[PDB]
C-alpha cells in the first residue's frame, strides 16, 4: 500500500503454512509415539465423522429458522434453503452417508449420536458459535462484506467515473478564461474520517480561489444534476506555492456520521477499519480504471503538529 | 416489511427453538437408553474439551497470519492480535486449563492431542473452514457487514438529511411562482436496480414539467455544492392525473454497476439481496428519524403488465 | 433456450447424482459382503494415497516441460510454475505427506513407488492421458475455453453495444424523411453457418428497399469508421408484408471460413458446436445487457423446403 | 517468437523426455531391489486394470449427465453419447474385458470393485476431478480451445484478408493525389490491451494527416459496408520523421472489455495469456498466407520510459 503505511495489506496464506507445519509436527509425534497406525486412521476417521454429524445437526437447526424466509430470501425454493443451510446437498449427503457407515461399522451409535446432538444444542443455545474477530474479518474481506467496499464503488461509479474524463476540458476552459491549476484532482483521505466542510478551517494556508465551469448531466431521473469543483491555493509562508482542485472524499463523512449514530451500529474502531479499507479499495479501482489515466492523486494522511497544506504541496511539487 | 412482500424480515430465534427441541429429544433418548449417567457426563465433557483444544490450535494457526498485520490492523499490540485470533484471552485460557486437566485426568493424552492437531491442520489446509451461506448471511446481517448498509447510511447522511428539511420551503416557493405539486418527495426503489437516467424512458406516461428552486450548500471542501430536484407529471389516458417530485434512489445504480464489474467481486444474487437490504435499512432509518415528518414516501416495486405511473399514482391517491 | 430447440442447455449436476447413487450402492455392497470394516478403510486410504503419489509424479513430469516457459508464461516465478503443475503447493504437499506416512505405516514402500512411477511414465509416454470428449467439453464450457465465447463477446462489445443504443434515432430519422420500418434490429443466426453476402440470393422474397442514415464514430485509431445497416422488404405472395433492418450475424462467417481452412484446425462438427454455443452466449449477453431494451430480435434457424422470408415475417408479425 | 520475447513458444516434448527418464530410473531401481519379476508384472497389470475400471465407472457417471443432452448436443444417437463419455466403445470394451479377466484370474473381486466404485464416487462428489492449470492450458492450446484463436481468425477472415490486397492500390491513389506513405499497414499489438480510441492520446508525438480512399464491399447481408484506414504522421523533435497507416488491433479491445465484465467470466491473467496467444496466432496465420505479400508489419510492445512513436519509427527504418 503506497497510500499510507497504516493501510493493511490483503491477507495471505500464513494460516496454511502454519497448518502445514502443525501437520508435519503431528505426523512426527505419531511416528515417535509408535502406536498402531490402524488405530490412528480409525480414530481420525471417527473424529471427522463426528464433525460431519455435528454439521448436519447444526444445519438442521439453522434450517428451522431459514425455512421461515423461503418465499422472500430464497424465492420459494426448498432446495435453495437446504443448500444455504447445509452447503451443497449432494456432497454433504455423501459425506454424511460415509460418516454414518464408518461410525456404525468401525469399533453404541445411537447413544453417541444422542450425546453429539446434546453438544450441538448446547453450543447453539449458549451462543458459543461466535467466530473470532480475525476469522470474521477474513471472511468479510474475502467475500467483500464491508461497508467500505460499497462506499468506494459508489464513490467511483457515481462521481469519479463521471467527472474525471471531462476534468481536463474544464481545466482547459478555466485556464483560457483566466493561475495555472494543475491538471489533476487531488482527493484528501483523512484516515481519522474528520472531514470539515470548509478546507480553510482544516488549515489556515488553504484558501478558496474560484470555482470551475460547472458540469451537467442527467442522473436517475434528476436531470440537470450538476457537479462543481472548487479551486484552492496552497499558501506557503504567506506566498502562493501552488493551486489545485482540492476536495475531501465525501464517503468518509458518511463513515464518521455512521460511527456517531447509535442506530447505525457502527463503532469507532469499525470506523478506522472501514476507512482504511475504503482507501485501499479506491486505490485498486483507480489503478484498474481507464478513466484515471493520470487524472487524480489520492492523498491519505493520519493526524498525530501537522499541516494539510504541506502534505498537498509535497504531493504537488513532485 | 410494508414496503414490498419480497423484503425479508430480520432473523428471529427459530434456530434456538429448534436447538431446545433437539436438546429435549436428546435427553429423552438418553433416558430411554439407560446408560450410566456419569459416563454421559464424562464423554460430554471430553467432547467439549476436544472442541476447545481444536479452537486453540486453529486460533494459533490464524495467529501465524495475523501477526504479519500487527502494526497496520492491530496497532502494534500483541494482546490485540491474540484477542482477535482467540477471542478473550482470559476466558480462553481458563477453558483451556480446564480442558487439559479433565482430559489428562478422566479415563493416552499426547496421542489424542497429536490426532486433534492432525485433524485441525487437515481442516485448514483442505479449506473446510467455510461457513454455510445462511450462517455467513446471519453473521453479516447481525454485525452490519453489508454493502447495502453503508450505502443506505450514505443516502440518508448526505442527501436526505440535507434535502428533506428544506423541501417544504422549496415547494412553497415553486407553488407561489405558479402547479399543485404534492408536499412530499417520492423515491422509487426498483428491486431489480434498473434505474434509467430519465423516467420518461421507463414509462412514457411520466412527463417532465420543471425544476425546483435549487438548494446550495458547502460540503466536504467543495463550495456551493448544489442539489436539484425535478418535478414530474403523472398522466392518465393522456390527462394530468397528478404532479410530484419523482426521483430514483441512486445507490441502486451503484449496486447495478458493481454487479456488472468483474473487479467488484459482486454477483447478481448478491445484487438482489443487497437491494432488498438497502430498502429495509432506508425504511428503518427514515422511520426512526426526525427529518422525515411525512416529507418522503419510499416506493418499492418489482417487474412482473406493469406501469410505473400507476404505481406512483396509487401511492399519491392515499 | 427459446432461440431454437437444438441449442444445448448448460450442463447440470447429473454426474453428481449418479456418483451419489454409486456411493450408496457400493456402501450397501460392502455391508452385504461382511468383510472387516477396518480393512475397507485401510484399502480405501491406500488407494487414495497411491492416486496422490501418481499425481505428484505426473506433476513432476509436467514441470519438466513447463519450466522452459518460466520467463514467458509464468513471469519468471518458480512458485507460479509449480502451482500450475501441481495445483496449490501447500495442499498438495500436505496430502502427499499424509499419503507417504500412511502408505509406509499401514500394512514394501520402495517397490510400490517404483511400480507406480513406471505406470505413470507408461501413461505419459503412450499418450493415455487423453480426456474423453464429454470431459473436455465440460471443462471448456465451464471455464469459457471456446472460440464461440470470444466471438460472441466480440460481436456484442464491438458492434451491438455501439449500434443498438442509437438505432432508434436513425430509424426515426429515416421514417420522418420517408415504409414504417420496425423499430428493431433483426439478426439472423444460421446454425449451419451458411452466410451469403446478398440476402436476395438466400431467398427471392427478401428484397432491398433503402439504407439507413450512416452511423459514425472513432474506434482504435480509425476514425470516421461507419456502421451502415440496409433495410429489406419482406415480399409475400407478390405483395410486401413487412420491412425491417435485416442482417446476418457475421461471426458465423468467421466460424465457417475457419472450418474450411486447414491451418485453423477447426472441424465441421466443431463448427456446429461453436455455432450453437455462440447463439446461446449472445442470447444471455443481450438478456442481461441494458442496451437491448427491446432493440433486437435474434432469429436462429436450421435449414432442413425452407423460406427465410417466412421466418422473419413470423418473428415480425407477432 | 520474433514478435516479442514475452510470447510463449508452443509446448514441446519435455514431459515425455522426463517420463522416459522416470521410466528408466524406475526400471533401474526395480533391478536393484531384485525381486520376482512375475510379481512386478502382476502388480503392474492389476494397477492398470484398476485404472481402466475406474475410467469405466467415471464414464458411466458422466453418461448419466450426457444422456440429457442427447437430442441437442449428440444428434439423438446413443452411440455418439457413449463415445463422448467412454472414448472409443470398442477399445474401451476390449480393455474392460481384459481387465475383468485378469482381475478375476490373478491372485476378493466384488469387494475390490465396490471399493473402486466408492473411491470414484468420492472423487466425483468431492470435486477432485479438476486438472492442473498447466494441463488445462496444454489441452486448450493443443485442441485450439482458446478465446484468442477465434479472435485471431476473425481478424484475419473479415478484415485483413479483405483489406491487404487493395491496400497497395489505395496507397497508390493517395500518393498520386498528393505524402509518401510507406506501402504497408502497421498494426500495433499492445500486450496489455490498452488500445485507446485515438493514437494521439497514446502518444502526443503521433499526429494525424488524412484518410485513405474508402473501400466498399458486400458482407453478410449488409452492403456498401466500407473499410476506412487513417494515415498518421510520425513526428520526432516536432518534425515529421515518417508517415504510415497506423492502426490498433481491435480484438484486443474485445479482450480488455471481456476482462472488465463479470458476466464474461474472463480474468486479467486470462487477458494477458489470451493477448499473447492472439499475437502468436496472428503472426503464424499471416506468415502462412498469400495475401500478406509484405503488406503488413505486426508490432508488439509492452509497457515498461517508453514512447510508441519511437517503436513505430524503429520498425519503419528497417
Ligand atoms: N465531492 C463530491 N462532489 C459531488 O458533486 C458528488 N456527487 C456525488 N458524490 C459522492 O460520490 C458518490 C456518488 O453519489 P451517489 O449518487 O452514487 O450516492 C449519493 C446519491 O444517492 C445522493 N445524492 C447526493 N447528492 C445528490 C444530488 N445532487 N442529487 C440527487 N441525489 C444525490 O446521496 C448519495 C451520497 O452522496 P455523498 O455522500 O454526498 O457522496 C457521493 C457518493 O459517495 C459527490 N462528491
Ligand atoms: N454487420 C456488421 N457491420 C459492421 O459495421 C461491423 N463492425 C464490426 N462488426 C462485427 O462485430 C464484431 C466486432 O468487430 P471488431 O472490431 O471488434 O473485430 C473486427 C475488427 O477487428 C476488424 N475489422 C472489421 N471491420 C473493420 C473496419 N471497418 N475497420 C477496422 N477494423 C475492422 O475485423 C474484426 C472482425 O470483423 P467481422 O468479423 O467482419 O464482424 C465484426 C466482428 O465480428 C460488424 N458487423
Ligand atoms: C481424535 C480423538 C482421539 C479425540 O481426541 N477425540 C475427542 C473425544 C471425544 F470427542 C469424546 C470422548 C473422548 C474424546 Cl478423547 C475423539 C473422539 C472420537 C469420537 O468417536 N467422537 C464421537 C463422540 C464422542 F466420543 C462423544 C460425544 F459426546 C459425541 C461424539 F460424537 C474419535 C476420535 C477422537
Ligand atoms: C481399492 C483397491 C483394493 C484396488 O482395487 N486396488 C487396485 C490394485 C492395484 F493398484 C495393484 C494391485 C492390486 C490391486 Cl487390486 C488397490 C491398490 C492399493 C495400493 O496399495 N496400490 C499401490 C500400488 C500398487 F498396489 C501397485 C502398483 F503398481 C502401484 C501402486 F502405487 C490399495 C487398495 C486397492
Ligand atoms: C472437499 O472435500 C471435503 C469436503 C468436506 C465438507 O463438505 O465439509 C469435508 C471433508 C472433505 N475432504 C476430507 C475428507 C476426509 C475423510 C473422508 C472420509 C474417508 C473418505 C477416507 C473415509 O473419512 C470419514 C468421513 C466420514 C469424514 C468421510 O469419508 C472424506 C473427506
Ligand atoms: C479438497 O480435499 C481434497 C483435495 C484433494 C486434492 O488436492 O487432490 C484430494 C482429496 C481431498 N479430500 C478427500 C480426502 C480423503 C482422504 C484423505 C486422507 C485421510 C484424511 C482420512 C487419511 O486419506 C488419503 C490420504 C492418504 C491421501 C491422506 O488423507 C484426504 C482427503
> d(Cα C128, Cα D51) in Å, to the nearest integer?
11
- The x, y and z cell numbers of residue C193, run together, are 453457418
- Long-range Cβ pairs for the range D51-56 (8 Å, 24+): D51/C119, D52/D95, D52/D96, D52/D99, D53/D96, D53/D99, D53/D100, D53/D103, D53/D113, D53/D116, D54/D116, D54/D119, D54/D120, D55/D86, D55/D92, D56/D86, D56/D92, D56/D96
Could you count the other beta carbons within 10 Å of the beta carbon of residue B272? 19
Q: Are A155 and A250 in contact (CB under 8 A)?
A: yes
Q: In sequence order, what are the beta bridge partners of A131? A: none
> d(Cα C54, Cα C56) in Å, to the nearest integer?
5
Give the residue carrying C-alpha cell 437444438. C6
Q: Are B186 and B315 in contact (CB under 8 A)?
A: yes
Does B225 show up as a binding residue in the annotation? yes
Closest CA to B91 of B43, B47, B56: B56
Closest CA to B21 of B9, B10, B29: B29
Task: Write phi, then psi, for D45 (nearest 5 degrees).
Answer: -65, -40
Q: After which residues is chain A discontinuous, taking C to N > 2.5 Å?
A: 107, 178, 304
Is position D10 within any domain? no
> d(Cα C222, Cα D231) in Å, to the nearest integer?
9
Q: Which of D130, D158, D189 is the last residue of a domain?
A: D130
> d(Cα D25, Cα D31) in Å, to the nearest integer?
10
Contact D259 B260 (CB under 8 A): no
- Residue among C20, C60, C84 minimizing CB distance to D133: C84
Using alpha carbons, list the distances in angstroms from residue B137 to A87, A134, A136, B106, D256. 13, 17, 12, 40, 33
Contact D122 A98 (CB under 8 A): yes
Could you count the other beta carbons within 10 Å of the beta carbon of residue C217? 14
**Overall number of domains in chain C:** 2
The angstrom resolution of this structure is 2.9
For residue B314, what are the contacts with CB-CB under 8 A and spacing of at least 6? none
> d(Cα B126, Cα B124) in Å, to the nearest integer?
6
Closest CA to C221 of D224, D281, D244, D173: D244
Ligand 1 nearest-atom number relative to CA B247 = 30
- Residue among C42, C90, C94 minimizing CB distance to A38: C42
3-state secondary structure of D209: strand
Q: Are C10 and C141 in contact (CB under 8 A)?
A: yes
- Residue among D260, D266, D267 minimizing CB distance to B261: D260
Do C157 and C194 fall within a single domain?
A: yes
Q: Are B183 and B244 in contact (CB under 8 A)?
A: no
Do A78 and A203 fall within a single domain?
A: no
Q: Which of A92, A93, A97, A98 to mutate to test the interface with D (most CBs of D within 10 A)?
A: A98
Ligand 6 nearest-atom number relative to CA D122 = 13
Do D255 and D122 fall within a single domain?
A: no
The kind and range of the H/E element at D240 are strand D239-248
Does C62 show up as a binding residue in the annotation? no
Count of B–D CB contacts within 8 Å? 18
- Name the DSSP class of B156: I
Q: Are A231 and A244 in contact (CB under 8 A)?
A: yes
- Give C261→chain B minimum CA distance, Å: 35
Does B154 show up as a binding residue in the annotation? yes
Do A153 and A257 fall within a single domain?
A: yes
Do C47 and C192 fall within a single domain?
A: no
Closest CA to B118 of C105, A100, A21: A21
Strand B206-211 to strand B215-219: parallel, antiparallel, or no bridges (unpaired)?
Answer: unpaired
Task: Write phi, then psi, for B185 (nearest 5 degrees).
Answer: -95, 120
A51 CA to middle of ligand 3, Å? 10
Q: In sequence order, what are the beta bridge partners of C186? A: C246, C297
> d(Cα B72, Cα A153) in Å, to the nearest integer?
23
**Closest-CA residue in chain C for A106?**
C37
**Does the Cβ of B306 fall within 6 Å of ligand 3?**
no
Could you count the other beta carbons within 10 Å of the beta carbon of residue C199? 25
Ligand 4 nearest-atom number relative to CA D116 = 1
Strand A222-227 to strand A206-211: parallel, antiparallel, or no bridges (unpaired)?
Answer: unpaired
Is position D271 within any domain? yes
Using alpha carbons, list the distances in angstroms from residue B124 to A99, B58, B119, B204, C277. 20, 8, 9, 57, 39
Do A201 and A53 fall within a single domain?
A: no
Do D168 and D297 fall within a single domain?
A: yes
Is position C89 within any domain? yes
Helices (H) and strands (E) in chain B, counts: 13, 7
- The x, y and z cell numbers of residue C117, run together, are 512411477
User: Quick one: D37 exposed, middle or buried, by C-beta within 10 A (0-12, 13-18, 19+)?
Assistant: exposed
Experimental method: cryo-EM
Task: Write phi, then psi, for B2 (nearest 5 degrees).
Answer: -65, -20
For residue C178, what are the contacts with CB-CB under 8 A and spacing of at least 6? C210
C116 CA to middle of ligand 4, Å? 9
- Give B100→chain D minimum CA distance, Å: 35
- Residue among A18, A110, A224 minimizing CB distance to B33: A110
Q: What is the DSSP string of chain C?
A: --S-TTSPPPP-SHHHHHHHHHHHHHHHHHHHHT--HHHHHHHHHHHHHHHHHHHHHHHHHHHHHHGGGHHHHSTT-HHHHHHHHSSSHHHHHHHHHHHHHHHHH---HHHHHHHHHHHHHHHHHTT--PPPHHHHHHHHHHHT--HHHHHHHHHIIIIIHHHHHHHHHHHHHHHHH-----SSEEEEEETT----S-HHHH-SSEEEEEEPPPEEEEETTEEEEEE--EEEEEEETTEEEEEEEEEE-THHHHHHHHHH-TTTT--HHHHHHHHHHHHHHHHHHHHT-TT-SS-EEEEEE------HHHHHHHHHH-
Q: Are D243 and D180 in contact (CB under 8 A)?
A: yes
Strand boundaries in chain B, DSSP class E: 185-190, 206-211, 215-219, 222-227, 230-236, 239-248, 296-301
Contact C91 B121 (CB under 8 A): no
Q: Are D257 and C165 in contact (CB under 8 A)?
A: no
Q: Kindly report the CA angle at C40 between C36 and C44, in degrees rounded to 5?
A: 170
- CATH number of the domain within which D204 lies: 3.40.50.12100
For residue D2, what are the contacts with CB-CB under 8 A and spacing of at least 6? D283
End-to-end alpha carbon distance in chain A: 19
- The x, y and z cell numbers of residue C220, run together, are 482504435
**Does the Cβ of C112 fall within 6 Å of ligand 6?**
no
Q: Are B176 and A198 in contact (CB under 8 A)?
A: no
Using alpha carbons, list the distances in angstroms from residue A240 to A180, A210, A232, A247. 12, 15, 10, 18
> d(Cα A115, Cα A120) in Å, to the nearest integer?
9
> d(Cα D92, Cα D58) in Å, to the nearest integer?
13
Is position D15 within any domain? no
Contact C60 D211 (CB under 8 A): no
Contact A44 B114 (CB under 8 A): no
Do B163 and B201 fall within a single domain?
A: yes
Do C53 and C96 fall within a single domain?
A: yes
Closest CA to B232 of B291, B188, B294: B188
Task: Write phi, then psi, for D31 (nearest 5 degrees).
Answer: -60, -45
> d(Cα B53, Cα B96) in Å, to the nearest integer?
7
- Name the DSSP class of D300: E
- Give B260→chain C minimum CA distance, Å: 9
Is position C13 within any domain? no
Domain that holds residue C292: 147-317
Do A99 and A205 fall within a single domain?
A: no
- The x, y and z cell numbers of residue A48, run together, are 471427522
Strand C206-211 to strand C230-236: parallel, antiparallel, or no bridges (unpaired)?
Answer: antiparallel
- Give C79→chain B minimum CA distance, Å: 18
C47 CA to middle of ligand 4, Å? 6
Q: Which of B62, B96, B130 is the last residue of a domain?
A: B130
Q: Which of A81, A98, A130 is the last residue of a domain?
A: A130
Do A265 and A296 fall within a single domain?
A: yes
Is position A3 within any domain? no
Q: Are A283 and A152 in contact (CB under 8 A)?
A: no
Q: Are B230 and B131 in contact (CB under 8 A)?
A: no
Is position D307 within any domain? yes
Q: Are D148 and D281 in contact (CB under 8 A)?
A: yes
**Does the Cβ of C45 fall within 6 Å of ligand 6?**
yes
Q: Are B232 and B206 in contact (CB under 8 A)?
A: yes
- Chains touching B, CB cut-off 8 Å, 3+ pairs: A, C, D
Could you count the other beta carbons within 10 Å of the beta carbon of residue D147? 30
Helix locations, chain A, DSSP H: 14-33, 37-66, 70-73, 78-85, 89-105, 109-125, 133-143, 147-155, 161-177, 199-202, 251-260, 268-288, 308-317
- The x, y and z cell numbers of residue D60, run together, are 458411466
Ligand 1 nearest-atom number relative to CA A229 = 3
Is position D158 within any domain? yes
Do C186 and C40 fall within a single domain?
A: no
Q: Are C248 and C190 in contact (CB under 8 A)?
A: yes
> d(Cα D117, Cα D53) in Å, to the nearest integer?
9
- The x, y and z cell numbers of residue B262, run together, are 468483474
Closest CA to C115 of D95, D37, D129: D37
Q: What is the DSSP string of B260-306?
A: TBTTTT--SHHHHHHHHHHHHHHHHHHHT-SS-SS-EEEEEE-----
Contact C90 A24 (CB under 8 A): no
C95 CA to middle of ligand 6, Å? 6
For residue C317, what are the contacts with CB-CB under 8 A and spacing of at least 6? C241, C242
Using alpha carbons, list the distances in angstroms from residue B231 to A218, B208, B234, D87. 14, 6, 10, 68
Q: Are B263 and B247 in contact (CB under 8 A)?
A: no
Task: Write phi, then psi, for D56 (nearest 5 degrees).
Answer: -60, -45
Amino acid at each position: 500500500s503506497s497510500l499510507h503505511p497504516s493501510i493493511p495489506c490483503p491477507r495471505g496464506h500464513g494460516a496454511q503454512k502454519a497448518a502445514l507445519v502443525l501437520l508435519s509436527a503431528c505426523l512426527v509425534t505419531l511416528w515417535g509415539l509408535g502406536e498402531p497406525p490402524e488405530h490412528t486412521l480409525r480414530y481420525l476417521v471417527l473424529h471427522l465423522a463426528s464433525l460431519q454429524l455435528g454439521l448436519l445437526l447444526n444445519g438442521v437447526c439453522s434450517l428451522a429458522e431459514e425455512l421461515r424466509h423461503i418465499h422472500s430470501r430464497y424465492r420459494g425454493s426448498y432446495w435453495r434453503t437446504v443448500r444455504a443451510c447445509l452447503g451443497c446437498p449432494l456432497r454433504r449427503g455423501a459425506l454424511l452417508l460415509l460418516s454414518i457407515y464408518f461410525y456404525y461399522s468401525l469399533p453404541p451409535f445411537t447413544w453417541m449420536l444422542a450425546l453429539l446432538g446434546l453438544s450441538q444444542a448446547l453450543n447453539i443455545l449458549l451462543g458459543l458459535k461466535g467466530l473470532a474477530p480475525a476469522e470474521i474479518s477474513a471472511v468479510c474481506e474475502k467475500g467483500n462484506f464491508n461497508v467500505a467496499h460499497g462506499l468506494a464503488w459508489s464513490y467511483y461509479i457515481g462521481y469519479l467515473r463521471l467527472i474525471l474524463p471531462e476534468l481536463q476540458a474544464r481545466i482547459r476552459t478555466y485556464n483560457q478564461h483566466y493561475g495555472a491549476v494543475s491538471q489533476r484532482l487531488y482527493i484528501l483521505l483523512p484516515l481519522d474520517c474528520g472531514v470539515p466542510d470548509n478546507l480553510s478551517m482544516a488549515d489556515p494556508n488553504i484558501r478558496f480561489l474560484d470555482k470551475l465551469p460547472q458540469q451537467t448531466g442527467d442522473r436517475a431521473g434528476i436531470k440537470d444534476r450538476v457537479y462543481s469543483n472548487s479551486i484552492y491555493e496552497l499558501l506557503e509562508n504567506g506566498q502562493r506555492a501552488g493551486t489545485c482542485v482540492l476536495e475531501y472524499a465525501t464517503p468518509l463523512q458518511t463513515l464518521f456520521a455512521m460511527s456517531q449514530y447509535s442506530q447505525a451500529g457502527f463503532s469507532r474502531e469499525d470506523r478506522l477499519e472501514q476507512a482504511k479499507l475504503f482507501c485501499r479499495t479506491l486505490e485498486d479501482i483507480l489503478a484498474d480504471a481507464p478513466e484515471s489515466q493520470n487524472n487524480c492523486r489520492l492523498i491519505a494522511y493520519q493526524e498525530p503538529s501537522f499541516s494539510l497544506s504541506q502534505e498537498v504541496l509535497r504531493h504537488l511539487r513532485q
